[PDB]
Amino acid sequence: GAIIENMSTKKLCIVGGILLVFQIIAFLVGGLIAPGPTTAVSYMSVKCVDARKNHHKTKWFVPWGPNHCDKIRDIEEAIPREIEANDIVFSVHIPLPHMEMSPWFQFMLFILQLDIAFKLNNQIRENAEVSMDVSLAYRDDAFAEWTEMAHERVPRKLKCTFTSPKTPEHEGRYYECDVLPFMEIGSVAHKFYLLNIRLPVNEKKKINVGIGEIKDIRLVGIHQNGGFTKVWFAMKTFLTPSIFIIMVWYWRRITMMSRPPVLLEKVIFALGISMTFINIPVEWFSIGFDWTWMLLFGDIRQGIFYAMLLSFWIIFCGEHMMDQHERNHIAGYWKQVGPIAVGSFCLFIFDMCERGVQLTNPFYSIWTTDIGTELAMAFIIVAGICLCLYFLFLCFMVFQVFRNISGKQSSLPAMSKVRRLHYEGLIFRFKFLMLITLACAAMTVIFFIVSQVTEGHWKWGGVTVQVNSAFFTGIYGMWNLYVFALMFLYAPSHKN
């Protein structure tokens, strides 16, 4: 007998009221205080000319400010000055003038967008690839030499189309090229970063030949807003004490009983631990230590919760068939849980492949070669099939539960007070959670669609509301609150 089966309809309404008030606050904080999730800043590179100086004495080229490079304003000016390919390096200073990076920025994503001209003598070949020679440095203060962070080679394929007719009238028009991935850094620990890209040409090896005429390179830097991180941490700090206390209350209720615990109780508690793991501000060390592994941690933690939530739903349904069941062991649901273990395992490998190599080579992409693409898709496809099998076995489980309920709720006159109240409770307990779970899922999906299609913010009077932010804080709070309700309402009822 769970607590939810002994609460009157009145008492449940009071609890619901309290839970709703908190849910409203969660939205208000994200919308009205947080600045919004992320910012993207566009950069244009400067074309610096090396006067045949850089051999082993790495000289870092600074786009602007004191000790700036000798730069060419337009690539065509190279020809009258006899400047050859390989003598021009593209320099970008990541923070803009009179701006700094701070540890509160959690990551940086970098993408490149090439501006390639059409000329009849310089067209893009069918299998055109760009081989970038890329070096990155960091600096902590203005009056210090740049210190190297990474030096790698970054081949990328070109995907470009030309929509005008290819005739001698439209020369000078640009290709329409897609976005190329470039770099992922999982930590922001230094104030300044300097990026130098060179494009060497070698005729006998077809290295950067037949890649068209390249005139400019654009870079976009994406980072999470500092104010969003600060608000997010404050929210997690609030939640952790609350989760800790209820976890301890729940534990003591389970163990101080006249009967050993049952399987559903063990699963509900285990789901509590997974949420406690995602609510701990482990990230509040990212502002003091340069730990590049925090982005993969975040993913693993979040992925575990998903697995636990999907498993809970299976066990819950399996624990509420009336006749023929009330089974209590883990070893016999492997028919319904297997698909989850396989799917999560395969996604784990996929993320580990992309994320783990990023930790050792910031200029990595699993989608660089045909073989990498084939394997990456194989893991996604398997995960997708397993998730669909999960959805079909959950639906059958539910179907069978309901037909059993229709039977049990019919042959009621011939049992006694003790057995009748027992089953009437189970019937209610089941129906209640199903309606709440569907409402929670429906709200999450509908608001993901209103975050992926709308503008991102709404200006209404003197107040600007952040919609993408309110999404994250509201849903984050919602599932934790739902787990809080689950542990309180479904704990054993104390009787004397």
Binding site: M99, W104, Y174
Partner: protein
């Protein structure tokens, strides 16, 4: 022309892209509003002169075979000559492309980090204030529009029929850029799935903007001048011909005076002759150059030009290949 400071793009320009800090000294067409700007926004002033230069190169490309080629006289006190003293179709284009050029050049220069006064600048902001270190600097995309509307449109508020034309066409340039920006999005999240999408707008190439305004040039409407005021006086405004046609706003070009004849030299109308021009150099068929010369007998010149040939043609510059000569037949008119 009609605006004088456009002359900064020619002659004295001499690549004054920040290495020549000539501030509010040479700007030849300047009102009190422009003086305040050029004194407060000094780091971005070289980008305005470059923006005009860009517009000049584009109009000369776009009109290379239209009798009127966008000619720029050496006087530098009137960069295109008297041809732009009338409210004609050619002026509408030059105004729109010049306005677009300034906004374009300023935005690119800010993206290169050439100025610390461009848009957002702050090294600190915890207490919530939409600063770099709390909320992000998202206002940097409107700066180029501010410079073009603040500096260029400073003499255009005088109550005159021509002033109305100029204001409309200058906005057409700025709107042409805004209408052609592209939206790109990067998908990232738990596993790369689109839980966080980050989107940005990118600038178009200027060739597309040139072509757009060239189409609007040919489709440009005729307006008539109407005058009234409440108090004793007149203010001149334009009345579009909405009896048959459909004139819009922030998309199109307007005019109200007739274009001149460009066939023969005429010093009073600012018209340069086409007596010495070439033809059959494009498709070598039938093209606008058949009317360009306004004459007949396009057969006068042979050439033996030297060019580089048999080359590898690398992705950048100074290919360093062999020379050869070719014989050309040029259908030059008299």
């Amino acid at each position: 022309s009609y605006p004088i400071w456009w002359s900064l793009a020619v002659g004295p320009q001499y690549s004054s892209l920040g290495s020549q800090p000539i501030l509010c000294a040479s700007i030849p067409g300047l009102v009190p509003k422009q003086l305040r700007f050029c004194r407060n926004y000094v780091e971005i002033m070289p980008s305005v002169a470059e923006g005009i230069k860009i517009g000049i190169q584009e109009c000369q490309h776009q009109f290379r075979g239209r009798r009127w080629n966008c000619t720029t006289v050496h006087d530098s006190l009137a960069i295109f000559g008297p041809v732009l003293d009338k409210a004609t179709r050619e002026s509408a284009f030059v105004h729109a492309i010049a306005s677009a050029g300034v906004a374009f050049a300023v935005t690119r220069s800010c993206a290169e980090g050439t100025a610390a006064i461009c848009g957002c600048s702050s090294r600190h902001q915890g207490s919530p204030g939409k600063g770099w270190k709390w909320g992000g600097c998202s206002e940097d995309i409107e700066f180029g529009g501010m410079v073009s509307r603040e500096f260029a449109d400073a003499r255009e508020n005088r109550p005159d029929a021509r002033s109305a034309m100029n204001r409309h066409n200058n906005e057409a340039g700025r709107q042409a850029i805004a209408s052609h920006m592209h939206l790109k999005c990067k998908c990232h999240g738990l596993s790369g799935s689109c839980e966080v999408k980050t989107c940005w707008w990118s600038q178009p190439d200027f060739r597309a903007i040139g072509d757009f305004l060239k189409d609007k040039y040919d489709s440009a409407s005729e307006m008539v001048v109407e005058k009234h005021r409440e108090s004793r006086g007149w203010v001149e405004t334009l009345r579009p011909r909405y009896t048959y046609f459909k004139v819009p706003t922030e998309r199109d070009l307007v005019y109200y005076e007739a274009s001149p004849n460009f066939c023969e030299p005429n010093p009073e109308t600012g018209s340069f002759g086409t007596r010495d021009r070439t033809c059959n150099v494009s498709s070598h068929g039938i093209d606008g150059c058949d009317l360009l010369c306004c004459g007949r007998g396009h057969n006068a010149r042979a050439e033996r030009r030297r060019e580089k040939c048999r080359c590898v043609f690398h992705w950048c510059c100074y290919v360093s290949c062999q020379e050869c000569t070719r014989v050309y037949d040029v259908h030059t008119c008299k």
